[PDB]
Amino acid sequence: SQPVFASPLNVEKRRLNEERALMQAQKANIQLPPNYGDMDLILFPEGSLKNSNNTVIPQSHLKGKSVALYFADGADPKCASLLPFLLNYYRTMNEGGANQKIEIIFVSLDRDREAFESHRAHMPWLSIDLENPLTEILKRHFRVMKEYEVPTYGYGSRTGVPSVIVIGSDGREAQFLPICSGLEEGDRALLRWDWRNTKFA
């Protein structure tokens, strides 16, 4: 139940968690429905994440990483301006060290497959392909949207396209990088990223 109660990711998480909880309830003085601290899920399925050589990787690879979703749209002048600085920041702060620090997972808000591939070819880190329901479920989970077509349930939009949002193991919001937000610093908010306290555990 973080950050949004009305998200498809969290309703699927809840259904799976209390389904399993009811299963060992009848199998076995237990608390129902299970609390969100003990609630658990997999944020990315087996065939979702895709690296620059177009070979699939699963979720457990991101241990010890500072992982952030990049919701982006290729035709947006916002994203066209933001992309080289994200490239620079990822480049220098992952090359300068003995430990691989951050990882970025790309979520597309593009028109179609051709535009998605043309935008993703300029981008080295992980990505989720557009035909996956994972991109659209993450958009509704973290409330990233350019125009109200999909119904948000009397609730907010955290940002417009693009954004980098660092994520936790259970889909929580660790911190918001203020590019297009209440703070409004384009191509400079990336220095607020702290890779220490937000590890994918």
Added chain:
Amino acid sequence: PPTLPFHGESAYRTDYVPKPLPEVAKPVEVKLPPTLPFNAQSCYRSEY
């Protein structure tokens, strides 16, 4: 002798015929901008 038959039609008899009525059917169809969804995301959940 013949009678010169009275040709004549006054102003009030000549110079207006019933016009077609003006074709008016156009409202102001305004697409409502959707209410921009609100996260001035508050203090308690925001920092702690």
